[PDB]
Amino acid sequence: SVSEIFVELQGFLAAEQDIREEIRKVVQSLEQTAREILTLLQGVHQDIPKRCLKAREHFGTVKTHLTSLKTKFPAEQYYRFHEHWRFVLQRLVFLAAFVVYLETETLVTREAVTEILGIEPDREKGFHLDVEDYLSGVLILASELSRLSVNSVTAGDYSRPLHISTFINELDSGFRLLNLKNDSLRKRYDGLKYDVKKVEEVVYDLSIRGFN
Template sequence: PLQHCLFVALLSQTILDNKGAYTALSTLENSLFTKPCSLSSMECCTISFSVPKKCQKAREHFATVRTQLESLKTKFPADQYYRFHEHWRFVLQRLVFLAAFVVYLESETLVTREAVAEILGIEADRERGFHLDIEDYLSGVLTLASELARLAVNSVTAGDYSRPLRISTFINELDSGFRLLNLKNDSLRKRYDGLKYDVKKIEEVVYDLSIRGLNKESTVGAGGEK
């Protein structure tokens, strides 16, 4: 019957489209997680003097990411973003974290959602198609907080006593911002609940510096370090 033929044709096209999408997504994931000492391993270099060079190299990798995201965008109808959102949600969240980490290392500021979207070559406005969902942005920022908590500890080990104080200020401001949000997403809410442990971990590092008398040295050197 004609209806059956149309259904089979539609199903076949859907399978082909999804195959192309999965190929594009797989390529994107591989570039993100398999390159040695690339974006996903930036933390190994954050307390060295080569931070600017590493950040520049990371931004070069984002050029590859933009190309792969551009390919991914062509595999899905623009008006069906959320139908397939789960396929790339985790990857985008990870990319947000990496972009936020690079920007923090460069300027010790929080990257905006619009800036991340520009770095990734996608839209910030959901009405314009393939975009950076606000919850994906927030999840990536929360991952940044966890990474900065580890960086605070590693900085002390490396003898950089000023950085934990600056990280503490940054994380406390971030926590204050999240407190203003009414988070209803269960997954995002759980991620946010973990922020208090990051705050506590950094506070313990700062307190340890204080009782060891190293915070005075940190305060003096904070301006030049930055």
């Protein structure tokens, strides 16, 4: 029996390793597409709406790559293979949010983000968007928008900086509402204060010079 059941176990282990293989490939294609989108939007550092539209269409190949990932594992074992797409997922949240900001200067909802990516809301069934992952993508957004503020002033746009300031402050207070237990997450939040201070100083830089 010992040899019997160790053979059985061999079967299972091979299975798992194949699942990790597939997932790895999909996540690879997805990281590629994410890098491309990131390049499009990064170009903002000068016709934005065209940039945002082109991003939105890349998110199509994103949607498909995700409906494909959904078939490389049994859905309920989500958190089992979570760590393989964690990074990509977060970056994607970031990108989506970034687009939405460039479009509307507002914060995209978690549910809106799922709909953009082509995954299922929490209430539905299948592939979900961790609250943690969402908040991470958001923090990345912030540190990206402080940079955007600076380059914006370099570009002659003295309006964005103020909007970005208000916005990032709203983020900071929202976060103040939360009790953060995740360690990597709390760690990343400790970096939001530097973004806040950065944008606030940009705005000060404009005010004492007579722009408002």
